């Protein structure tokens, strides 16, 4: 997250870190056994880390649970990033508490202008590289589909939305991928892609979670 703020420990209780020996992507806890992330974060050997603030220090509220299964969306296209969403099942159920909590799925799509909370452990610089140990947060609005398409000609599908600031300076970034965009208490987006980070006229692009609720629910119900 570039241009954001330190969230505070366990203030974003649905935020997960995906770990394969190291943090590599975010995710969102949607019930005691399932995490939603980006398909481009897929790999084997995932350990889900819940209850994290500093990802390099054991602070006392963590739960580390290996994944039993991951399910990339059936129509994910890694070239275009269309349908950039995946589900991860935990080998054992998380113990839910005030610091480790699910986030609700949307019941309708969000609108441009809605303020959302974007979070992660990704790069905090737009030029250069610095990776935080503690969770970072950014409040940002959803942008109109027409501004999004104009920013990224030929690249924005109906399964994507833009959020952020056209002036630059405030955005998600590498290492935030897979993490949450939460608006009014609902998971509306997944950190997906952008041109660089925090660049003028190049807002963040996010997977549009509301399009996937039926697939998520049906997949969980049978897996």
Q: Is 59 annotated as a binding residue?
A: no
Q: Check if 23 is active-site.
A: no
State the CB neighbour count (10 A cutoff) for residue 82.
19
Which residues would be at the binding site for Ca ion (CB under 5 A)?
52, 54, 59
Residue 61 CB, nearest distance to Ca ion (Å)?
8
Q: Check if 177 is active-site.
A: yes
Residue 52 CB, nearest distance to Ca ion (Å)?
5
Residue 152 CB, nearest distance to Ca ion (Å)?
35
Cα–Cα distance, 198 to 22 (Å, whole number) = 25
Q: Is 62 annotated as a binding residue?
A: yes
Identity of the residue, 17 or 124, whose beta carbon is nearer to Ca ion in the bound complex: 17
64 has which bridge partners? Answer: 49
State the CB neighbour count (10 A cutoff) for residue 51.
23
Q: Catalytic pick from 17, 40, 73, 192?
A: 40
Cα–Cα distance, 36 to 50 (Å, whole number) = 13
Q: Check if 84 is active-site.
A: yes
Q: Is 52 annotated as a binding residue?
A: yes
Q: Catalytic pick from 23, 84, 102, 119?
A: 84
Residues 6+ apart with CB under 8 A from 64: 19, 47, 48, 49, 50
Residue ranges of alpha helices (H) inside 40-178 are 145-151
Identity of the residue, 63 or 83, whose beta carbon is nearer to Ca ion in the bound complex: 63
Identity of the residue, 133 or 167, whose beta carbon is nearer to Ca ion in the bound complex: 133
Q: Is 177 annotated as a binding residue?
A: yes
> CB–CB of 193/25 below 8 Å?
no
SS3 string, 28-76, reads: EEEECCEEEECHHHCCCCCEEEECCCCCCCCCCCCEEEEEEEEEECCCC
Residue 28 CB, nearest distance to Ca ion (Å)?
18
Q: Is 158 annotated as a binding residue?
A: no
Identity of the residue, 52 or 84, whose beta carbon is nearer to Ca ion in the bound complex: 52
Whose tokens are 């980006």? That residue is 38
Q: Enumerate the known binding-site residues.
A: 52, 54, 57, 62, 171-172, 174-175, 177
Residues labelled as active-site residues: 40, 84, 177
Q: Enumerate the known binding-site residues for Ca(2+).
A: 52, 54, 57, 62
Q: Enumerate the known binding-site residues for substrate.
A: 171-172, 174-175, 177
């Amino acid at each position: 997250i570039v241009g954001g703020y330190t969230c505070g420990a366990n203030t974003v209780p649905y935020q997960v870190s995906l770990n394969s020996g190291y943090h590599f992507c975010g995710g969102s806890l949607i019930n005691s056994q399932w995490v939603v992330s980006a398909a481009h974060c897929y790999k084997s050997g995932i350990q889900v880390r819940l209850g994290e603030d500093n990802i390099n220090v054991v602070e006392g509220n963590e739960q580390f649970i290996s994944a039993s299964k991951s399910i990339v969306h059936p129509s994910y296209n890694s070239n275009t990033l269309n349908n950039d969403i995946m589900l991860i099942k935990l080998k054992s159920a998380a113990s839910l508490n005030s610091r480790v909590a699910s986030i609700s799925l949307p019941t309708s799509c969000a609108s441009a202008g809605t303020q959302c909370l974007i979070s992660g452990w990704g790069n905090t610089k737009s030029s250069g590289t610095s990776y935080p140990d503690v969770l970072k947060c950014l409040k940002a609005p959803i942008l109109s589909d027409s501004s999004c398409k104009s920013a990224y000609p030929g690249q924005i599908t109906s399964n994507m939305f833009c959020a952020g600031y056209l002036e630059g300076g405030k955005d998600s970034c590498q290492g935030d991928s897979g993490g949450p965009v939460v608006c009014s208490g609902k998971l509306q987006g997944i950190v997906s892609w952008g041109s660089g980070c925090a660049q003028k006229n190049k807002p963040g692009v996010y997977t549009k979670v509301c399009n996937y609720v039926s697939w998520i629910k049906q997949t969980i119900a049978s897996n």
